[PDB]
Enzyme design. Structure first.
Site, PDB file in Angstrom:
ATOM      1  N   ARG A 247       0.680  -1.300  -0.089  1.00 43.40           N
ATOM      2  CA  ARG A 247      -0.058   0.371  -0.055  1.00 43.40           C
ATOM      3  C   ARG A 247       0.754   1.375   0.153  1.00 43.40           C
ATOM      4  NH1 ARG A 247      -4.386   2.670  -1.721  1.00 43.40           N
ATOM      5  NH2 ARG A 247      -2.484   1.328  -3.411  1.00 43.40           N
TER       6      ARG A 247
ATOM      7  N   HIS B  41       2.552   6.195  -3.996  1.00 44.43           N
ATOM      8  CA  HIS B  41       2.910   7.112  -4.612  1.00 44.43           C
ATOM      9  C   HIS B  41       3.378   7.526  -5.902  1.00 44.43           C
ATOM     10  CE1 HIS B  41       5.317   7.878  -0.189  1.00 44.43           C
ATOM     11  NE2 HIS B  41       5.065   6.560  -0.341  1.00 44.43           N
TER      12      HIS B  41
ATOM     13  N   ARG C 251     -11.274  14.711   4.714  1.00 44.25           N
ATOM     14  CA  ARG C 251     -10.653  14.142   3.248  1.00 44.25           C
ATOM     15  C   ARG C 251     -10.611  12.204   4.088  1.00 44.25           C
ATOM     16  NH1 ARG C 251      -5.172  14.787   0.968  1.00 44.25           N
ATOM     17  NH2 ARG C 251      -6.533  16.761   1.438  1.00 44.25           N
TER      18      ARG C 251
ATOM     19  N   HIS D 172     -11.803   6.339   5.220  1.00 43.58           N
ATOM     20  CA  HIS D 172     -10.703   5.353   6.422  1.00 43.58           C
ATOM     21  C   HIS D 172     -12.157   4.680   6.799  1.00 43.58           C
ATOM     22  CE1 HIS D 172      -8.370   3.253   9.212  1.00 43.58           C
ATOM     23  NE2 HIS D 172      -9.489   3.668  10.229  1.00 43.58           N
TER      24      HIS D 172
END
Lengths: 1031, 229
Positions: A412, A417, A927, A932
């Site tokens: 993850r 990136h 966000r 989450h």
RNA sequence: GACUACCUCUAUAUGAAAGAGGACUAAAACCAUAUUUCCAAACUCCACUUUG
């Protein structure tokens, strides 16, 4: 004219090839500038456009062929001289005509009285036919007097074909040479230097916008206004205003840009090219609000300018950005976005095992230690037996929880990136760290025995899967040995190596449609024999549908998708079946035939690319997707040729047997997965079946675009790990007392949904006495999140639960008979369609269709199936919400790293970001709890509809993403069989509040009919809107 | 007829549930009592003349569905010749006809949805087949009945002169002889079926009732042929 | 037009920038679901929605 591109020109398609140095019109696989000679062959359609551009809308058919033969020589034929004369020319002419048209030649320099040319087409045409004295007009004589018109059309074609040709060549990527490009660049540099780019109040005084917007209102408020006309004369008034301010539109470039934004606002709310459908509001064009909006949709083009070359700085292609590599970035971000949203749902399940109250990133290394400290130990063992089939001990829960988060975190962290990926060394993960640091391997860890108790149980998962569908009951043991013993085919965990491969229910249902056909027309015979039945409410059919499902997925798809000969032989049948009949209207006309020594993944990568390039053109005009029914027939004919060349055509005849066969079904199976896939498997065990299936579909789209011969072998090894986790899927427990510790803890929990004396019954006890039975959708909710959310839902009203009339509604009628009648009546309607106009007959049919729909909501409510529907609906909303918040996460790295390219350096980064009013700490809060999955952990705070209101405060960054949030809520709910309406946004303080929620209708028995049925029920819709609005 | 029109907002009043013979005929009589004035200077003598033959009782309306690219053409035929026609967009703009909810998922645009209104207003509709670029036939029909002909060589000007001859033949056949006798047999069959249902609501499922419907259908098919004669 | 998109290029500034382009940018569509909606076929180019 309409389509410069996506058009056959020399039996070759046309594409545009953009570059940083300019634009380019090119054929299909070539690279040359053909923008001169493609644009020259696209000139017989400029002639056809001008003839429509001189004729009126109730098109007189013979004024339409006078004009078309005056321009083109071949187009001109013969017409009666008297016939055109009898008609009145002025009525059939275009609005621009019917009066005096004035134009200047292209070549002529400046504007002068002599240079302007006068044409009265009605007067000119009348005098030329007066000189025509013959049965048919003679082309040389008539045309000669028409010279003043023919010179107009040549000028019109040559000037419009020169503006389009200039528009293509200047359409370069990240332009700084154009007006409006230099201006955007100028404003972008006056923000990095924290200054003010433009002043709305001072540019609105040069524009004299007080003189506009009061003449706009004086036209809108004008007496005898017509809603069919008002957008066209609000257009003329705006154009009249520009004509007066024209001296400084040409010399300012921000008063020019201010005009284009107010030109563009005027045809989104008062449209002129958009099928009007609605009256505009005078709220929309008033001083103060029309310059509130122009400030808002001119800052939007600056923000889209910054991130479009923050993207060109992340990928080091800011000077060699081609049309192809933007198209290549678009593919790899489709897979990266899809792979992030499955690492966030597996991180959600690792939250619930360890500590359900944590609302931060648990896959952080240090914050996992603070979350590991508070574990209810009795819950983790019971949770572990659901995700994994094995039983864990007390001493092993220190090390299995670091083995799981070490399977998500190194994968993850690499994907998020935005940089160059190496997909080898992305799926190895030998080690994982345990701090209290001691790095453990996965080979010597406890997880290794969760593979050779797992890979070696594949032949018995197939046998135990078959018993569940009663395949063994309806087929003999000697008739299943010859479906796993076929040469070459050998029961793979792979499904398909080709992108856009259909599913089985699309193949079986549509294959039924080509075999069973009315047989009364020039038949499109595909020579089919196995798509035999559709009786889903039988059990002999339900055994053959399930046996065809796994012959197709586990045996047919792996071989058919990789044989060049097998795939081509099915593609060559479908092409020669279509283009071998009389007429020109043939659908698969412009798609090529599969080459020899071509892999099936390379042919369907072409079918994928043609399906997506022609999607805009197929939606301008109401055209069907002929590529979708091409992919159907290749796979429909392909699965029929498999099942008949091999002798497996008895599957069409189940024939339930009485003699018990205590025989064994031996299947062969081999797999070369080594113990390096033992960390991606641990992520796939934390995913739901729907998530696993859709990540496998996106993994095969990306794998069919890579070039290296290894690193595709990396993906086809990870793609087999997915199919080994779909074999387990929904096992569940069989012993009662391994999910509840008492008979009373069961009875306490199950009485949240039936809450009565009905638990001592036949559907809720096993068969006799007081031994409980477990419900397959009541631990499906315990396995995932959603268990504290659905308890809050059913505790609102007592009519949601199962009452005594619901079971009593299951003994009212037979039910199977109703379905039998509903089928007999429907079949009759086909032979006698006039039964629809027989009130007594349609009143009976409707009654029989209601008795089915009421019984099946009663059948589902009693077995608590509707609890599973709510859980599935809940997951698809929170994950689509999470897909938007990871697009904002990408944009933060595309704008922040561009500022860094121009806490020592972190101080100067964020202070720029509050000057643009970008990503705040109040938006990073919103966000986080969306991405989450923090709606699931009990305590609400805000509802679901207040999360979609949070999603468009984060994405108000740009309107492309802000407008699409609320369009996606209506599409998720429409997939689940409902509607939603939403009371207006200017009245509810810009919040989403439900105006109307109703079940989708089905509209039986024709097209102009009133017999219909609800797709779900009225009782479920009430249940659904109390889940959306629930704090 | 099939009475099925979508909700229509007409000159400020909304008409809904137009799926019966009583709610459609309440909408057509609203359209003829609806007042208007026409604004154009080129077409003052034409458009005001069109809303006079139509308003007059002895007039026949012809729809001619998809005359041009995006254009329907309403024709009014007077008792002694005199066929005039306007575009159907002029008809909608003078009488201010809209859709009541244009954004519902089960709707299309007014170029598609208004064909239901116009097949309840008109007597005859025309639909060219255009077999491979050029024309093939015109396919005339009646809207009260469903007797459908198929003009082969007639031009647009020629076809209008045939519609009064097409209406005369259909009306004469209905008035007397075979239509009176054939219609009576169908009515008797319907009564028997109706009574059969009344004894038992489950009679429709039985084959004997199903066989009776087949006879009724055959009679109706035979009845249309008498009208075409 | 939040739903009922957005962006880029284009100047004889008007028969109109009311034009073209976009896998280039988004949304959809595609994908291992619990069952009622009959179904099959239907090439390409061009108009452009106004009581003017």
């Amino acid at each position: 004219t309409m389509r410069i591109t996506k058009v056959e020109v020399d039996r070759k398609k046309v594409l545009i090839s953009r570059d940083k140095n300019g634009g380019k019109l090119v054929y299909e696989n070539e690279m040359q500038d053909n923008t001169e000679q493609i644009m020259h062959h696209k000139k017989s359609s400029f002639y056809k456009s001008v003839v429509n551009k001189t004729i009126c809308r109730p098109e007189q058919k013979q004024m339409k062929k006078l004009v078309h033969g005056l321009l083109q020589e071949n187009s001109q034929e013969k017409i009666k001289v008297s016939d055109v004369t009898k008609l009145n020319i002025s009525n059939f002419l275009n609005h621009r005509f019917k009066k005096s048209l004035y134009y200047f030649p292209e070549n002529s320099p400046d504007k002068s009285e002599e240079y302007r040319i006068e044409i009265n087409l009605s007067q000119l045409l009348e005098d030329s036919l007066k000189k025509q004295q013959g049965t048919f007009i003679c082309w040389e004589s008539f045309s000669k007097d028409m010279e003043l018109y023919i010179n107009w059309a040549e000028n019109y074609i040559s000037s419009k074909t020169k503006l389009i040709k200039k528009s293509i060549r200047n359409n370069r990527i990240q332009s700084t040479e154009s007006r409006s490009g230099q201006l955007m660049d100028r404003y972008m540099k006056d923000i990095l230097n924290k200054n003010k780019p433009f002043d709305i109040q001072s540019v609105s005084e040069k524009y004299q916008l007080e003189k506009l917007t009061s003449a706009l209102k004086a036209t809108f408020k004008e007496a005898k206004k017509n809603d069919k006309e008002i957008n066209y004369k609000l257009k003329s008034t705006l154009q009249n205003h520009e004509r007066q301010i024209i001296e400084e539109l040409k010399e300012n470039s921000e008063l020019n840009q201010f005009n284009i934004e107010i030109r563009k606002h005027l045809e989104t709310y008062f449209p002129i090219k958009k099928t009007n459908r609605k009256v505009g509001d005078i709220r929309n064009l008033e001083i103060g609000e029309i310059q509130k909006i122009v400030n808002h949709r001119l800052k939007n083009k600056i923000v889209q300018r910054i991130l479009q070359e923050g993207k060109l700085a992340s990928y080091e292609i800011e000077s060699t950005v081609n049309s192809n590599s933007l198209q290549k970035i678009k593919i790899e971000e489709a897979f990266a976005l899809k792979f992030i949203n499955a690492c966030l749902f597996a991180s959600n399940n690792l939250r619930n095992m360890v500590y359900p109250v944590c609302k931060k990133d648990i896959l952080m290394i240090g914050e996992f230690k603070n979350s590991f400290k508070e574990i209810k130990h009795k819950k983790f063992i019971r949770q572990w037996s659901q995700f994994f089939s094995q039983e864990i001990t007390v001493d092993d829960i220190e090390l299995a929880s670091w083995g799981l988060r070490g399977a998500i975190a190194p994968i993850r962290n690499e994907i998020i990136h935005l940089k160059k990926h190496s997909w080898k060394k992305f799926f190895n993960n030998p080690t994982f760290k345990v701090k209290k640091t001691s790095e453990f391997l996965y080979k010597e860890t406890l997880f290794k025995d969760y593979f050779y108790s797992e890979l070696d149980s594949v032949p018995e998962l197939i046998i135990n899967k078959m018993e569940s569908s009663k395949i063994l009951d309806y087929y003999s043991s000697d008739q299943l040995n010859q479906v796993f013993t076929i040469p070459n085919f050998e029961l793979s965990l792979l499904t398909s190596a080709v992108p856009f491969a259909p599913s089985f229910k699309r193949v079986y249902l549509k294959g039924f449609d080509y075999q069973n056909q009315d047989e009364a027309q020039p038949d499109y015979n595909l020579k089919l024999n196995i798509y035999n039945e559709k009786a889903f409410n039988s059990e002999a059919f339900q055994a053959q549908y399930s046996l065809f499902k796994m012959v197709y997925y586990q045996v047919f798809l792996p071989q058919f998708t990789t044989n060049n000969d097998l795939f081509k032989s099915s593609v060559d049948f479908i092409l020669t079946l279509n283009k071998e009949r009389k007429g020109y209207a043939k659908a698969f006309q412009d798609i090529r035939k599969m080459n020899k020594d071509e892999k099936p993944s390379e042919y369907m990568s072409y079918i994928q690319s043609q399906l997506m390039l022609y999607q805009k053109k197929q939606e301008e005009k109401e055209k069907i997707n002929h590529f979708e029914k091409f992919i159907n027939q290749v796979f429909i004919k392909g699965f029929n040729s498999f099942i008949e060349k091999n002798r497996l055509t008895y599957i069409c005849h189940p024939t339930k047997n009485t003699v018990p066969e205590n025989d064994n079904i031996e299947i062969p199976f081999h797999t070369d997965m080594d113990d390096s896939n033992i960390a991606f498997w641990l992520m796939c065990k934390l995913l739901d079946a729907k998530q696993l299936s859709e990540l496998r579909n996106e993994m095969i789209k990306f794998s069919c675009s890579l070039q290296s011969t290894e690193e595709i072998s990396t993906f086809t090894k990870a793609r087999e790990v997915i199919g080994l986790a779909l074999l387990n899927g929904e096992k569940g427990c069989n012993d009662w007392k391994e999910l509840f510790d008492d008979k009373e803890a069961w009875k306490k929990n199950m009485s949240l949904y039936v809450s009565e004396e009905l638990l001592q019954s036949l559907p809720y006890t096993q068969e006799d006495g007081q031994t409980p039975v477990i419900n397959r959708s009541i631990d499906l909710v315990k396995k995932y999140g959603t268990e504290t959310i659905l308890e809050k839902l059913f505790s609102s009203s007592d009519d949601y639960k199962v009452s005594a009339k619901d079971i009593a509604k299951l003994h009212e009628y037979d039910v199977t008979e109703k379905i039998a009648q509903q089928e007999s009546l429907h079949k009759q309607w086909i032979e006698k369609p006039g039964l629809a106009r027989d009130s007594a007959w349609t009143k009976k049919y409707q009654n029989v269709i209601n008795d089915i729909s009421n019984y099946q909501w009663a059948k589902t409510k009693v077995e608590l199936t509707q609890v599973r529907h709510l859980h599935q609906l809940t997951i698809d909303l929170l994950s689509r919400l999470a897909g938007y918040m990871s697009i904002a996460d990408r944009d933060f790295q595309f704008s922040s790293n561009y500022i860094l390219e121009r806490k020592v350096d972190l101080k100067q980064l964020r202070l720029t970001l509050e000057y643009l009013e970008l990503f705040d700490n109040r938006l990073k809060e919103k966000r986080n709890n969306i991405s989450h999955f923090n709606y699931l952990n009990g305590q609400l705070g805000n509802s679901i509809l207040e999360l979609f209101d949070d999603a468009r405060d984060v994405l108000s960054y740009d309107r492309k993403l802000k407008n699409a949030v609320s369009k996606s809520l209506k599409e998720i709910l429409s997939s689940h069989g409902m509607e939603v309406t939403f009371k207006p946004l200017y009245q509810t303080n810009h919040h989403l509040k439900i105006d109307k929620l109703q079940p989708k209708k089905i509209h039986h028995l024709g097209e102009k009919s009133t017999v219909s049925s609800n797709q779900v029920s009225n009782e479920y819709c009430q249940l659904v809107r109390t889940l959306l609005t629930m704090k | 007829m099939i009475y099925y029109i979508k909700d229509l907002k007409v000159k400020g009043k909304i008409f809904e549930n137009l799926m019966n013979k009583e709610a459609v005929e309440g909408l057509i009589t609203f359209l003829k009592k609806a007042e208007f004035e026409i604004y154009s200077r080129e077409n003052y003598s034409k458009y005001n003349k069109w809303f006079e033959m139509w308003k007059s009782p002895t007039s026949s309306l012809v729809f001619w569905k998809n005359y041009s690219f995006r254009c329907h053409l309403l024709f009014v035929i007077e008792k002694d010749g005199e066929c005039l026609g306007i575009p159907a967009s002029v008809f909608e703009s003078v009488l201010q006809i809209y859709l009541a909810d244009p954004f519902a998922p089960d709707t299309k645009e007014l170029f598609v949805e208004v064909c239901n209104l116009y097949e309840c207003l008109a007597d005859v509709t025309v639909v060219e087949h255009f077999e491979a670029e050029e024309s093939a036939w015109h396919k005339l029909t009646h809207n009260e009945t469903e007797v459908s002909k198929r003009v082969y060589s007639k031009d647009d000007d020629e076809l209008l002169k045939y519609i009064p001859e097409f209406l005369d033949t259909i009306a004469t056949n209905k008035k007397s002889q075979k239509y009176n006798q054939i219609q009576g047999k169908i009515q008797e069959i319907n009564k028997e079926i109706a009574t059969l249902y009344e004894s038992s609501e489950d009679y429709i499922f039985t084959e004997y009732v199903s066989n009776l419907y087949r006879e009724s259908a055959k009679l109706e098919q035979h009845s249309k042929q008498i009208l075409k004669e």
